[PDB]
């Protein structure tokens, strides 16, 4: 054999969280982002009633909603504004956060073009087409690729990125975005592709799903996923989108990627004949886990955290726990390098609700963040545990309070990397499990570019705000410079400044934002580009400009669109890539036509 | 490494074709099954008009429709009649033809229970839910698993069969059921599952798809897929369902399966940045083919037939041909064991239209039948070839007339197995290709059983009609007997008769159908079953009954529900399984409630 996979880039938007940073902020602080259904979507009052006796009524007025579900920047993607009204927000959000995940990795689209890169996204029809019917709008040809065929989403981005790997929507209900990971890893092992992007997108656009699920007995009448609690009585629905970029580990180490964590094993199965169609199967879950850790070949006593599927139902939570206990017990007999095993269990659903198609990727992202800050955040609404869990004689405990994620120790007597598992189960019975292992590893020119002046200003403000918040030190200057130099598409509106410290850079960015560095437009300097064309002695001159570190002169040429081999500023081993703010797309509104 | 996969069972229903037999009948006779839209679905007159100028109108009144899209036998599958109204016909047809494919293989559900068998079906939302909205029906809890979540289809059958392999819907538009094959083969190579069922289901339930596709310029205003023709001007839409059972080749040879053909290589890619989003890419198609045949490791000059994607468009057909020419030319340079290479090209779409989700599986089934009858059937509507094909200096020719499929010869001087390729492309740019290689290999008790008396009579009539039509000889008696003995679920209503020739069997079946053999009900002989319980001396008695070939006595016990070890009637090497009529499900109508 199994070739471990590196997670080298992430992006996302969750309830109460605009980005990954604000998402971790909420988790660490134990925030609950479940709200009442906004009038934006529908009026919960107009559909209120007893679901068991009233026609088309539900008592569920809650959900985890995200901001800007209608926000899109169609011109960035070569889509006209008129056509953007017909494109399903499922696809719009998909394209946006795939790009963001690429930038977060520091992988330039140029580098991707022509490659066998795959895309596997949890997505499906979430009701956008129904809004067209309600509005009594004419059927148009735009609808075909617009919002009638869900696979157009991933396919649209493969077209845009010019990649040739498999491009699939994954739809296995609530396990979708985790099966997507499994499918991606699988595709990388067998040669189908070399790199991959995976994740999920989930949107709640009509009240129909709320009403049917309510009448089927799935939804909590409290509107909270009270996982592991004694009061667990159903789940609460949430919107969201998550993306991860995957590269083979050894490729990621050669290419100088920054790594969030390493996928060591994955597994996918089906529950077979259970009690009913929608009943979970503990035997199937235990077999799932065994296969995953057998493939990872890790001692089960090293796994210190489990992200449970944990939806917050009456008999769902104990069954999952039972599967866990049976799995580890079996893995112990099969092969004891850490005494007194203790493993925490939590569920991100207590914070943001059940993201369904995007549920799996929300779980993974939470775990990756926990590894970064070495903290196990609190699981919500479970002050009183379900008495049927019975964790007394097991390594497991619910993470009821925020705490340090302690690394366990060898029999040889030294620190092991943190290891964790995520589980996602569908109501149809499709189960997926993934095993994550923690990864164990003078002035310059700071360049920025964007499609237009407004976007360029937004890029500068983002870099500014992230610097003021001390998220970087002077130590990270050359990494930030290198990542912007080679890990960003060179767009038309450009900005460059020379800096040696974090303080100098902050001042020159602030000066630019204030409205007072080098500035230019690539398309309006065809004269200059013609002068600095490819010539053999020109190449010597540029090389000397680089060798003698004439940064201000190199920078002024660059903002005019002159190609600079930034690679030669550095020795054999380039600085390792670093996570920087991704593109600030225009927040323009596109929805159902008049 | 590559482990070749055996196709050991098939089933299906296509326009103008109730089953596989009638499907081959149509192909051999060059029948065109495209008809006008039946009043059953919608009134084409009520939506007629100029698509380019008229609101909600289309000039397309044609399509390839199948019979009994509303027919289901819910009690067979443990589904109540009331719930059957809410289950999408996509799922209903799925369950039906998965079972039929299993029976065709001679694989008993008992043998499947507990195994890691996967299910990968081309399916999606085709508009059943929209019929509920039109009818202004109340939202019910049944809808969730009924017709709102497409993955419930495959998952429902995995539940029913008690299998634990991956259970996914595959939706990559028009390449779906071929990607499904690819996904299945892939899952069998990497240990995800040991056996798999793959295929596609496509249904046309509302006029919406017709109108949008028409306004988008996809549909032929002649209503015919005139592939390779000079008159090619779009495709025609068709309904259908196809299923294949897949086993690892060496497992199929050990288990005594009958084999339709061997999958030697598969490939899946994406077209990347093409001319437009929906434009095909010849370079991507050529790379697809190269990978497939490189994996199959077969000399390209041995491939004598290609089932083109062949949709019948203006620039689609030449682009596909160009991809083929470039692919083979490249495969030649890479490594010449048959001089004067000639390879035929055809498209089943000329016969039945474009089955979309089920398009790929229709192509494969056509090819498998062609291998069985050693015949390349006529491609329709192409008396005048597209002048842009340019096949003069290539191995390729359109199969314009029915002809014998000649097997090519070695450089060593002897016959090679027939080899062929199927291609399926999606409008989103997802491409799949599969490489098939032809497979090169005294009275008894005939038992039959079913859920009820009516179904048992139907089973007997099917066996009767297939015997009268000389589809078997006396040579196949022990194979037919063995397949019914071990390759059928033992159901409640039973029928048994002793026979030594095909004539004797036909008479006793006819006698049963006439209303005049052994007969019984398993659930009403608990007394007899108690007497013939498991006892150690009872085992000796039954064994002697088998050894001394007391067939009439064994048969009378069997119809009363007494377990008979039919395995011991035969030596070490059992008779090879044989394709027999599959279950004749009740043709009861279930549709949108009042």
UniProtKB/Swiss-Prot annotation, chains A, B:
Origin superkingdom: Bacteria
Subcellular location: Cytoplasm
Coiled-coil regions listed: 488-516
Domain Ketosynthase family 3 (KS3) positions: 2-438
Annotated catalytic residues: 174, 309, 354
Reported function: Involved in some intermediate steps for the synthesis of the antibiotic polyketide bacillaene which is involved in secondary metabolism.
Similarity annotation: Belongs to the ATP-dependent AMP-binding enzyme family.
Miscellaneous comment: The acyl carrier 2 domain binds glycine.
Name assigned to this protein: Polyketide synthase PksJ
Organism: Bacillus subtilis (strain 168)
Classification of source organism: Bacteria, Bacillati, Bacillota, Bacilli, Bacillales
């Amino acid at each position: 054999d199994f070739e471990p996979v590196a997670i080298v880039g992430i992006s996302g938007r969750f309830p109460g969280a605009m980005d990954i940073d604000e998402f971790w902020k909420n988790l660490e602080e134990g925030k609950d982002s479940i709200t009442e259904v906004p009038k934006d979507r529908w009026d919960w009052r107009e559909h209120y009633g007893n679901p068991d006796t009233d026609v088309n009524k539900t008592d569920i007025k809650w959900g985890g909603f995200i901001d800007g579900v209608a926000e899109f920047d169609p011109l960035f993607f070569g889509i006209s504004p008129r056509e953007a009204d017909y494109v399903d927000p499922q696809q719009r959000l998909l394209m946006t956060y795939v790009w963001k995940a690429l930038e977060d990795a520091g992988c330039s689209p140029q580098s991707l073009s022509g490659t066998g890169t795959g895309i596997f996204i949890g997505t499906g029809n979430t009701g956008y087409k129904d809004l067209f019917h309600r509005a009594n709008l004419p059927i148009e040809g735009h609808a075909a690729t617009g919002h009638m065929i869900p696979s157009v989403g991933p396919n649209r981005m493969s077209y845009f990125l010019n990649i040739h790997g498999p491009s699939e929507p994954v739809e296995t209900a609530x396990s979708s975005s985790l099966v997507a990971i499994h499918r991606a890893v699988t595709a990388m092992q067998n040669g189908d592709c070399e790199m991959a992007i995976a994740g999920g997108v989930n949107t709640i656009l009509t009240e129909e799903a709320h009403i049917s699920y309510s009448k089927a007995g799935m939804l909590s009448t409290d509107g909270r996923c009270k996982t592991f609690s004694a009061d667990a009585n159903g789940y609460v629905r949430g919107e969201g989108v998550g993306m991860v970029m995957l590269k083979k580990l050894e490729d990621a180490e050669r290419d100088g990627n920054h790594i969030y964590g390493v996928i060591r094993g994955t597994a996918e199965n089906h529950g077979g004949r259970a009690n009913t169609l929608t009943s979970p199967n503990p035997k199937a879950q235990a077999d799932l886990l065994v296969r995953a850790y057998r493939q990872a070949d890790i001692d089960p006593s090293t796994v210190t955290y489990i992200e449970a599927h944990g939806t917050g139902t009456e008999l769902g939570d104990p069954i999952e726990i039972n599967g866990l206990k049976a799995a580890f017990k079996e893995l112990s007999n099969m092969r004891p390098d850490v005494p007194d095993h203790r493993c925490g269990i939590g569920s991100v659903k207590s914070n943001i609700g059940h993201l369904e198609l995007a549920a799996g990727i929300s779980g993974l992202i939470k775990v990756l963040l926990q590894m970064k800050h070495k903290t196990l955040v609190k699981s919500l609404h479970c002050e009183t545990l379900n008495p049927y869990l019975q964790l007394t004689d097991s390594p497991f405990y619910i993470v009821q309070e925020k705490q340090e994620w302690k690394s366990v120790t060898d029999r040889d007597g030294n620190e092991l990397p943190r290891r964790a598992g995520i589980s996602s189960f569908g109501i149809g019975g499709v189960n997926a499990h993934i095993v994550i292992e923690e990864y164990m590893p003078q002035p310059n020119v700071i360049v920025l570019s964007a499609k237009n002046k407004s976007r360029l200003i937004d890029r500068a403000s983002q870099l500014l705000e992230v610097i003021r918040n001390k998220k970087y030190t002077d130590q990270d200057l050359h990494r930030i410079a290198y990542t912007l130099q080679v890990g960003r598409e060179e767009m038309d509106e450009r900005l460059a400044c020379v800096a040696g410290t974090m303080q100098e850079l902050e001042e020159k960015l602030q000066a630019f934002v204030d409205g007072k560095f080098f500035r230019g437009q690539s398309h309006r300097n065809k004269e200059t580009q013609t002068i600095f064309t490819a010539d053999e002695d020109m190449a010597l001159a540029l090389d000397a400009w680089i060798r003698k570190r004439k940064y201000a002169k190199l920078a002024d040429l660059w903002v005019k669109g002159v190609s600079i081999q930034w690679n030669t500023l550095y020795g054999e081993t380039k600085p390792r890539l670093i996570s920087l703010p991704s593109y600030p797309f225009a927040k323009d509104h596109y929805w159902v036509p008049a």
